[PDB]
From a paper:
Basement membranes are extracellular structures of epithelia and endothelia that have collagen IV scaffolds of triple α-chain helical protomers that associate end-to-end, forming networks. Recent studies in one of our laboratories revealed that the NC1 domains function as recognition modules, directing the selection and assembly of α-chains into protomers and networks.
Since all recombinant proteins used were prepared in NaCl buffers, and since hexamer assembly in the BM from bovine lens has recently been demonstrated to be chloride-dependent, the conformational changes observed in α2NC1homo and α4NC1homo that prevent chloride binding may hinder the final protomer–protomer assembly. It is unlikely that α2NC1homo and α4NC1homo could represent stable physio­logical assemblies, but the structures of the individual chains in these noncanonical oligomers might provide a frozen glimpse of transient conformational states in the process of NC1 folding and hexamer building.
Author numbering:
A (entry chain C), C (entry chain B), D (entry chain D), H (entry chain C): 5 to 195, 213 to 229
B (entry chain F), I (entry chain F): 5 to 195, 214 to 229
E (entry chain E), F (entry chain E): 6 to 195, 214 to 229
G (entry chain A): 4 to 195, 212 to 229
């Protein structure tokens, strides 16, 4: 009874590993602006795969007349698909095909990620079954609770596709989402596609 | 299982003890200015080995526009490498080869440090294998939660190399890091003129 | 294992009994001015034996540029050696030979103190080993949590040596320490060596 | 082992049941003026048996220059001996022979009280050892935490001597104590000595 | 485990055969405005108080000793089968109008079953029956242990139907009076009033 | 402008010739632990209370009506020239032992002058004299209107020296007793005790 | 009449008020209450710096602790020293009395100010003003508070008649003790053994318009 | 009875206008880090001219043992003299000759500043007396209380000397001060010394 | 004395009415997101004319390293100039010629605005001199402290030029400013299709 979360980084839903039942499908949510530091926002948690997309994930429900959202915060970040996004900002409707899809599955045991911090793909531990190879992705670099090194352990630190533009911003209070100004953000670097060469590799493993 | 942290005190990653899987590698963070009293800053914890260096570790992520850092506190201290560093306070780019590197490893048991509080090397417990010899380093001397003596039990109270200037300061809101004005700080004195005054220690594990 | 703490009441470090390994050596800290009730200040706890002596044990570290101490209170009490104290208050340097030394050791079991509340030496429980005899010392007399009776069970309530002037005070924000004006403070009386006779006696025991 | 507490209601120290080791001796403290609600003040707890008597039991220690007591609270109540108390108030020194003494012992199991709520002595449960008979005394009658009924379960609800003036009051800030104005206070009544007849009876039992 | 019985008379109830009686008291139903995390169920020992007073919020019943600070004053106690006059009474006059109760050590945890019609619901398969009654549900709000979850408690099953099941006590008035509303807190069906009320049974696995 | 007189007896003082009397009461010296911004000077009307009670902190003297919440209980009243027994008394017994007072409409603001020796200090140049006394300074701390500034008040000049100038009242005890200390609050010089005390005079510009 | 003027003798003798100004009262020179609120001003130019009764606990409303219980943390107090030299050990409320400076408060016809030269010369009083005393510039409140720094210089409190190696003492409240102050020449404003220091200190004068 | 403040921007004290008495002399303090927004830090206020220099202006007094400073803040800024400052940071002692001197004077009326927001020197109002010409300096640009436009009215917005490096930073907790990294900071610009040409001019006037 | 503020709605400073000294010149700030309720953001106040534009007006000064801005709030709205602005959200440098310019002047008396709430130009009071004709603009419509009608008394409720897009938004923590999605906002409707629907006003002073 363990959860494993998969981000396709495309507009297509991923399929769960053979022998793992699909629990639900969603949209890949990376980060919620000004949340509690008491809240973990790892891509490896169920909370990063949301069944319904909306520019206001902070609201309990998506009907303002029933659940009214009080706080100031309306910026949210979502991993992106491989479709290139126009400079002109977009609305809740037109943004959908640019958002990454995801799935959550019932895993026989807890999955962990291993990292080489060089260009080699690190091996899975001795008796474990391998699930995917990736590039190391570490957003939570601050010395917070679960941060830095501890985050590297989660399936959420290993994305399958290297990307110049790994994610997009959503303004809540405005109902808009647009591409991200900075490049190569949060990719963990090593101790043209010459950028891809600078990036740590990883593998996600499970004991079955 | 159990975690074991190594600080090289150099711009070179340490190697994990033969037989212990390496989990990650980073930079040696010693202290974050003014935190929750109960939150612990020991060199023996995984939290002291950060995969990415930045002059602002208080921020959740390293992009200002994504994670805004609200609080006042922006001082951080990092183990310096064996390099001699100039009088000019530097920035997040220049400072990198001056910061100590570190590694975290999965140990088979809980490692502990022993101290002699004199100039002799204290012996490891009866059936315990030895990992390293060092000098006693005790930053947390106040009578806080897990301070003083209880800090001496930690592998983080045993650094391999003595150094006049063991660490450096980083101003967050200034994006700058300089060398530390005071010398021979946090070393635990006895009950190369200084090397003599300093307690000696050893880190052991029951394998 | 468990912890045992010894206060020599002299400027020499005590040796651990019964072949118990010595963890470390320090100075005997009795009490911190205005601590929370949540923080216990017993002479039987490791936190009473500090590796480095400083007129300001409230600071996390002993360099003020690194660790700034924010708050009002800097009165600290340390146990005294047998050396007589001069009238003139003294700074962090000159006080050192006047502070009691201590040691912490890994004990096979939990040490308790027994008290007679008369002039006789009380016996250890049946199958227990005797560690030291002394005088009953009870600072924590208030009806707090861990107070009175409860504090009597601690090894910290049994000082080996009777003393007119058992401890001393340290003004932090003044960086000074001087003898204590009151005499025979905190000793537990019976239900000028005439004073010594009014004092309850105790023994510290462990089950080995 | 568990704690069992005994209040003599005289100036003499009670003796612990045969086979039960005496941990310490003290003075019977019934009630501290306006403590936190989370604070239990049962006569069955160690906290009611204080090794040192003072008119200010709120202060951590008994030397004001070391431990300063900030809160306003200064009244405290102590069980009384059989010796008649004069109408003229008294000081910490002169009040000593009027206060009850008490003992704490290591018991083989948890002691409980059984109450009849009539004039018959209730029996101990089937295989339990009897420790003493008394009169039902229930101070904590309000509907607070471990109050009312819950308190009757305590050995502290069963005092051996019926008394018109069961306790005395101490004003802290004054350093004074005087006999209590009200009579027959806190005795649990039944569903010259016509009063004794109106009182519930109890027995303290332990499983040995 | 504990079992609480409310007689709804001025006589103390007897514990079911086989269960030792721990104590006896007065039936307290509710204390005006207590912190949400505090449960006021008639199946808890806290509902059976050894001494009655118009001020149960005070730690002790001598106010020169225990001073009660907070504003909150009213309390409600189950009433006995006694005609209650119109004059708001005092602590002494009121005693014989209060229900008495008893707490017992039960060999297992007792539960109440409810039919929510006029029939007597059956005890579960190998369970002993303790009493039949009418469904009584004060805690209807969707608070912590509220609504249905309170229905599980033996405290939701009173043996005697009454038009005036309980009374009010003003604390800082030292006064208690009959209650203005009628048929309050009885759980109705999915005296012609007795007919509208759900029936219940309290069972234990012995 | 107001002028307050404390007789230190059980007789009400007379207002100085020419000044209308507004009311009469009992001499309240001090209320245990009140917010710093509240001044307790004997030269303020608040020190002369029309009704005496062992609980002046309550808005009214019927507690079923005005409930007093805060912990603070003790009050001190100037005592009359009456031998006080050792038994702590109640609100009724204590009345004839309390000083009485009167408040008057004065044509100008009265001030007290002090000599801080044994001599009687002279009134300022064209000022009328009202009374001679002994220097009395309770408010010695360096609080708001404290120390010397309190010396300006007519409330710092009592006509009668006394070893026991005042008494204590426990609120939630309904009790008042004589005070343990002696010669308290009298201002000393820069019964052999009367000799040690500074002398004063209360003057007004009429 | 009008305004207050405060005089600190820095001796055990009470000063006399100048120019026939009436004396309102006499007392002891209180310099500073430990960690008072920033909303309370502690200048030696205010009446509150001259206390009629000396106590090692001036935070208390009155000097009988059974009546006025003082609750808060703040303990220490500083009084201006007299000319007589102190011993090394702390002393009690009784012994310390002859070591505390005396003072007086007077009714002035106008508000008195202080002028400073910020060198070794004595600065002149304003044109039509009479001089009241010469001194040495003394500035405790140097922080950038509400009425601090240069603004405190305007106060007659910034001009002490007597230069002193040891201008004040400390009193530990909850200890009931007072002792000599370790530091020397503290709070004197400098110029842009004892004889050397005196030269480095700015001079002042306190003036009033009568 | 009005105050007028003069900053020499040299290590020499300024002289007050003829006919204005000098009240005191000091060091030019521009800004205190993390102060109340309830605190005005204008160069035109008396609070900007401090008689004693120290790296910790936040402390009531300059003896830590008497007035203990509690808050985190130790950065302070001071206008500079014309002496060029070395790259190596300096201490409270050696920094002194680099700090600007100032004076406060008694003015017959309130002085105001006028600004051209171009390269011309603006004239003083019709019957007013001119005191000095300057370059417009506006630090308080935020929409705070006295900020922006309102600050322009104060004598403090008109400095006599244009400067590449108008001020220096002082770290408190470290006891150090060093030159400032940014250039031409806070100079109000217009609607080689080609920088001086871009700067608004001003004049400070008084009604006499 | 009294202050009078003019907004040009162009990249050109307005001129003060003949006879009124100019005190300073700036940029038109309309609104700061989420302030102290009692703090007033009217265009008739000197606080609406800021000498230096920046995308972060909440900060005390415009240097991050000197004045750190702690609070969350970083949205600001500024009167746009008659320029048509592209779909790209711009930065603090690009945005400048798009911001309305303004002037503050010392007026001899208190200026007020009158409104007709129809399409006619309302007349100035009897012996009052006229300053400008405009369109009624009322942002503060909530029943706050000095809102609704009482805002209409202010010279700041009368802008000279009607405009479909009267203002722009600035994200502080993003250092960006873009055009506003909604159109015809804050104009006060009647009791060039839109110009007709809009109340007309005049600003008068008693000189």
């Amino acid at each position: 009874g363990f959860l494993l979360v998969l981000h396709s980084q495309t507009d297509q839903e991923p399929t769960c590993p053979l022998g793992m039942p699909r629990l639900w499908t969603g949209y890949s949510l990376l980060y919620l602006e000004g949340q509690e530091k008491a809240h973990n926002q790892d891509l490896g948690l169920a909370g990063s795969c949301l069944p319904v997309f909306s520019t206001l994930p902070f609201a309990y429900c998506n009907i303002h007349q029933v659940c009214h959202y009080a706080q100031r915060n309306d910026r949210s970040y979502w991993l992106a698909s491989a479709a290139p996004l126009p400079m002109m900002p977009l609305s809740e409707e037109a943004i959908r095909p640019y958002v990454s899809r995801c799935a959550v599955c019932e895993a026989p045991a807890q999955a962990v990620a291993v990292h080489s911090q060089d260009q080699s793909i690190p091996p899975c531990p001795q008796t474990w079954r391998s699930l995917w190879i990736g590039y190391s992705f570490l957003m939570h670099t601050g010395a917070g609770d679960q941060g830095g090194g501890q985050a590297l352990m989660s399936p959420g630190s290993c994305l399958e596709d290297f990307r110049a533009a790994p994610f997009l911003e959503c303004q809540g209070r405005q109902g808009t989402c647009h591409f991200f100004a900075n490049k190569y953000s949060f990719w963990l670097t090593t101790v043209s596609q010459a950028q891809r060469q600078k990036i740590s590799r990883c593998q996600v493993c499970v004991k079955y």
